[PDB]
């Protein structure tokens, strides 16, 4: 507990300084390096979580995802870097949801307010996930670039979101394993629906928006389960990410709401 605490703490200082340095011209190159060590320290230190098992599945999954991902990033043309940022972002959010989802269906929550936090992070995660994939698809030409519009869409979107929130709250009284898969389907479903109307040209602001969204997703997820490394880094990026989205929109001589709609 106390050496993990100590490690995860130094990890925050490494992400804070790293993010701090990524933001200034002379110091940008080191920033990613500092944050890098942050990750390393964090990934090692978490091996010593008490009650830790399934190590083969763990080593498999770290190895599988980290390498295939690295492989892709290195081969891609500089011209496709926006969608790469998108798709790695999506999966960050998917992870936020998986954390939520597992804990939710061991119903491992005593505090119902923590449960609520977890569910909120699940919803936001799931949205970022499929939201960032639609973004990718569009850039890659796998889908229509321009706003995918239809009859009374505004209403169907609000409706799914409303339905999702609602059946989400449901898990506080009844946490039936059927309600959980429904909750996530709807959260993933609302992810896609949210981004159909977003034009390819606005995609930089959508992606910055989803980046804020998964950051927030993971900070919430971190508070719900007792994990400081997520709590800090999560909200650090959620907060910096929303500001970034404002500045990116401003720069593109246009507004965030506009991006979201048609």
């Amino acid at each position: 507990m106390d050496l993990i605490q100590a490690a995860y703490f130094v990890v925050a200082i490494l992400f804070i300084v790293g993010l701090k340095r990524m933001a200034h011209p002379t110091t940008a190159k080191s920033g990613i390096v500092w944050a890098g060590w942050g990750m390393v320290l964090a990934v090692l230190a978490t091996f010593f979580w008490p009650g830790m098992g399934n190590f083969a599945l763990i080593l498999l999954a770290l190895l599988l995802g980290s390498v295939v991902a690295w492989w892709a990033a290195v081969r891609v043309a500089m011209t496709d870097m926006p969608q790469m940022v998108a798709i790695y972002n999506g999966m960050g959010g998917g992870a936020a949801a998986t954390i939520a989802a597992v804990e939710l269906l061991k119903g491992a929550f005593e505090n119902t307010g923590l449960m609520a936090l977890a569910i909120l992070g699940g919803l936001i995660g799931s949205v970022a996930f499929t939201g960032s994939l639609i973004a990718f698809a569009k850039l890659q030409g796998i889908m229509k670039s321009r706003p995918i519009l239809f009859p009374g869409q505004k209403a169907v979107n609000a409706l799914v979101l409303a339905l999702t929130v609602v059946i989400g709250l449901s898990l506080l009284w009844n946490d039936a394993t059927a309600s959980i898969v429904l909750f996530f389907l709807l959260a993933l479903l609302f992810g896609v629906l949210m981004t159909l109307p977003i034009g390819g040209g606005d995609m930089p602001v959508a992606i910055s928006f989803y980046n804020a969204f998964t950051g927030m997703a993971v900070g919430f997820e971190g508070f719900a389960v007792g994990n400081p490394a997520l709590m800090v880094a999560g909200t650090l990026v959620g907060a910096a990410g929303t500001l970034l989205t404002v500045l990116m929109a401003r720069a593109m001589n246009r507004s965030v709401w506009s991006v979201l709609v048609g």
């Binding site: 990524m22 011209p25 190590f55 763990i58 960050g92 597992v102 993971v218 650090l236 907060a239």
Partner: protein, 94 residues
């Protein structure tokens, strides 16, 4: 929030103020690399997914916890790689 409700709320808001604050005064040329690095940083989701996986029973929990770690690992690995390549655009040639 957790580990002292007030304790945690102070952390939440301070971290949020601090995060927001570091990014003010960022230049335009650094927008997207900043996005990539911050995207890389929420790559710590692995750590959380890792713990979910480590304690998983029921097998469903292992499956979905297994995906969690893959997804989380690519976010960190891929985000790191991508940020590094963007930063190489600023560099001269000889």
């Amino acid at each position: 929030m957790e580990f002292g409700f007030w304790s945690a709320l102070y952390i939440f808001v301070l971290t949020a103020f601090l995060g927001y604050e570091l990014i003010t005064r960022v230049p335009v040329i650094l927008h997207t690399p900043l996005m990539s690095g911050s995207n890389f940083i929420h790559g710590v989701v692995v750590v959380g997914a890792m713990v979910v996986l480590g304690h998983a029973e029921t097998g469903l929990e292992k499956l979905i916890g297994f995906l969690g770690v893959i997804l989380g690992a690519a976010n960190a690995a891929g985000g790191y790689a991508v940020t590094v390549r963007m930063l190489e655009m600023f560099e001269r040639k000889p």
